[PDB]
């Protein structure tokens, strides 16, 4: 990479297809998850806040408590254990 | 149920391909195993497709090979009708054979080694550089095709 | 059907596009209510570089305030045709514009469930000439 | 310089003029020859088909086209036929003209990428195939071996 910022090489993953453009529905930003639930991490291009480092896009962790309205999701990066601070706007229930 | 025979060595073969063979209980060239026809097993054999010979054997052939190259989970003991009867649910090799083919049981379930350590093919096989459709010995075989190979390696 | 299809005057905008005013005074008397400043956009050579800047005034008259005005404005104008809107409007003159439309216009001007007026329910240049011409004067 | 230096399609496509400057103009004079006033209303249609994917410098395109059309004057300056070269040299080519240090070359020309089996030239003629000859001379000045193909023409 010519640079090493968080958004390096994120053109694709953080851009919306033209039709999904614009403010997103509020329903999924308010969704509530319970500790132990599996959730898929995927940033919503349209939603600025509550984000995590683009490298985790595609991870499926385990909700384990929350911080403020933001959730704390445990994932495993390669072989390392990590906790991600992320809002409902960027999570989905597995299955 | 298909008869699997490794015909190509481990040197230079993808690791994830080698492990697969290992999961299918084959750890040496000419070693053969019997595998159910399921989605899960199908994927496995297709991945291994280029270093093996496989196909559905005839009742007879299986019996020949079972009698000739089957073994107990441990020990020399010959697996003959008596052994089969005094150790398995069946009464004789034929009964076992039928059960394997109809995928009702497995070599392990009957206290037998998952592996039929075959002998080199008497007369030599068709080559390990081309599949069957091309005159070689790799890939899926005919029941008549598998039988010939198994029989030559009895 | 009719009655709710027949034209009516909705606001008459009288504005003096000056280039930098004292003019408000006359607009207040010619109409009868306070004028509004006219800021301009973009910086330009007519020494009009100032973005926010008084450069004229306007007055939007509604109801009687609009008629009572046109009852003298119109007479001071002759023109008609070609000089009419595709929506049944027309500007003459110091400018004096007359916005015309039919009864259910609030539908497009309110906040809740607003909507645009269907082309059919719109006012045509012709249907406009009729209404006005039918009110103290002549067309073309 | 030799065709050997650029005839292969092994480099990435390099055509974004928004990121490339100093590209040399094309030597290709025209793409439509003959009676371009008329439309393909001819009995016979022959085409020159490239038999291998290659790159063809605007150099070769011009020499190939000229040698074919210049000859199509076996029919006259205002003869009844239309000639078309459907490819355009989009691909920008470089040359590293320091040794292998900072070697990204400088723009030196353009080439058109043709895939084997595409027709680079199409001519329209009445039963009067002098055009078949105009192409024996054309594929003479382009890298690949070529196939002279006739389409509407069961008048053999």
């Amino acid at each position: 990479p010519s640079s090493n910022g968080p958004l390096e090489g994120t053109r694709g993953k953080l851009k919306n297809k033209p039709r999904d453009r614009g403010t997103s529905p509020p329903q999924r930003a308010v969704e509530e998850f319970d500790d132990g639930e599996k959730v898929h991490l995927k940033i919503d291009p349209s939603v600025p806040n509550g984000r995590f480092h683009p490298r985790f896009d595609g991870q499926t962790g385990t909700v384990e408590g929350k911080q403020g309205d933001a959730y704390k999701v445990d994932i495993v990066d390669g072989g390392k254990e990590k906790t991600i601070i992320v809002t409902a706007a960027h999570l989905r229930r597995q299955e | 149920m298909h008869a699997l025979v490794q015909l190509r060595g481990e040197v230079n073969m993808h690791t994830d391909i080698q492990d697969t063979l290992e999961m299918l209980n084959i750890h040496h060239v000419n070693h053969c195993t019997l595998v159910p026809e399921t989605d899960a097993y199908r994927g496995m054999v297709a991945k291994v497709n280029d270093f093996v010979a496989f196909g559905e054997p005839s009742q007879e052939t299986l019996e020949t090979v079972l009698a000739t190259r089957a073994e107990p989970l441990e020990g020399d003991a010959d697996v003959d009708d008596e052994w089969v009867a005094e150790h398995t649910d069946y009464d004789d090799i034929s009964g076992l054979a039928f059960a394997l083919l109809s995928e009702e049981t497995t070599l392990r379930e009957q206290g037998l080694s998952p592996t039929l350590r075959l002998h080199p093919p008497r007369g030599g096989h068709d080559g390990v550089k081309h599949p069957v459709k091309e005159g070689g010995q790799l890939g899926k075989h005919d029941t008549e095709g598998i039988d010939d190979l198994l029989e030559a390696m009895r | 059907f009719h009655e709710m299809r027949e034209p009516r005057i909705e606001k008459v905008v009288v504005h003096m596009g000056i280039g930098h005013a004292n003019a408000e005074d006359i607009l207040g008397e010619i109409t009868g209510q306070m004028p509004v400043r006219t800021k301009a956009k973009r910086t330009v050579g007519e020494f009009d570089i100032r973005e926010g800047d008084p450069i004229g005034a306007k007055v939007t008259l509604r109801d009687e305030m609009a008629e009572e005005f046109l009852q003298t404005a119109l007479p001071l104008a002759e023109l008609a045709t070609s000089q009419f809107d595709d929506t049944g409007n027309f500007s003459f003159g110091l400018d004096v514009t007359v916005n015309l439309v039919r009864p259910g216009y609030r539908v497009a001007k309110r906040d809740k469930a607003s909507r645009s007026i269907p082309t059919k329910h719109r006012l045509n240049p012709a249907d406009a000439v009729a209404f006005i011409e039918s009110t103290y004067d002549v067309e073309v | 310089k030799p065709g050997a230096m650029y005839r292969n399609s092994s480099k990435p496509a390099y055509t974004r003029r928004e990121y490339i400057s100093g590209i040399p103009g094309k030597k290709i004079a025209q793409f439509d020859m003959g009676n371009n006033g008329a439309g393909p209303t001819y009995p016979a249609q022959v085409e020159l088909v490239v038999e291998k994917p290659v790159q063809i410098r605007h150099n070769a395109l011009e020499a190939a086209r000229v040698a074919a059309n210049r000859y199509v004057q076996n029919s006259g300056a205002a003869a009844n036929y239309k000639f078309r070269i459907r490819k355009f040299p989009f691909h920008v080519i470089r040359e590293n003209k320091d040794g292998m240090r900072a070697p990204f070359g400088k723009p030196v020309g353009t080439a058109a990428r043709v895939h084997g089996a595409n027709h680079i030239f199409i001519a329209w003629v009445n039963p009067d195939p002098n055009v078949e000859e105009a192409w024996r001379r054309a594929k003479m000045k382009v890298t690949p071996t070529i196939n002279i193909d006739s389409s509407p023409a069961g008048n053999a």
């Binding site: 033209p18 039709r19 403010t23 329903q27 | - | 906040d111 | -």
Partner: protein, 186 residues
């Protein structure tokens, strides 16, 4: 509409019915919403909760079914709004609802407006709602005094036939009084 790349707003935004930016902020509280809506002739008040396939209305009141309790006056006024608020607030309590936030939709936060009257009503019904007292009308106006005085400048009845000639903010009290004890559907 125009092409594959064209962006069509959400249905409720095309209809110009739902302000989604406000909606989200409203849903942040995690509390039920006290939906305060109006009509030329009526005033509605609902207590909505969030659901899997859409909102769930647990308790509601319409200025129309106000008569069902003795209302003999118009229903698109201040006193009407308050009571419909109180009525929905009571049914709300009955449903086990204790708190909510005021959603006024696309209406404006004008002081003493009917939506705030609706909010006052629901609050007095027992519902706990984040509010601000000095944005509410001064009680008298809620009673309908502003209208009684307006009929004082009579010469012609403010009400075409209807009930009374000089109107009754008293009729208002009688009703609030009624709603504050027993009765069906409450």
């Amino acid at each position: 509409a125009t092409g594959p790349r064209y962006k069509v707003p959400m249905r409720r935004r095309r209809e110009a019915r739902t302000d989604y930016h406000q909606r989200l902020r409203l849903l942040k509280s995690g509390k039920p919403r006290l939906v305060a809506r109006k009509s030329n002739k009526h005033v509605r008040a609902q207590l909505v909760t969030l659901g899997p396939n859409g909102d769930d209305t647990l308790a509601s009141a319409h200025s129309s079914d106000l008569a069902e309790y003795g209302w003999e006056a118009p229903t698109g006024n201040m006193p009407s709004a308050y009571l419909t608020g109180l009525l929905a607030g009571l049914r709300a309590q009955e449903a086990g609802v204790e708190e909510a936030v005021l959603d006024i939709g696309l209406n404006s936060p004008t002081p003493g407006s009917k939506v705030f009257a609706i909010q006052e009503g629901a609050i007095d019904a027992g519902l706990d709602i984040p509010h601000n007292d000095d944005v509410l009308a001064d009680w008298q106006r809620t009673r309908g005094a502003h209208i009684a005085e307006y009929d004082e400048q009579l010469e012609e009845p403010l009400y075409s036939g209807d009930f009374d000639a000089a109107d009754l903010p008293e009729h208002f009290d009688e009703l609030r009084e009624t709603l504050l004890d027993g009765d069906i559907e409450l």
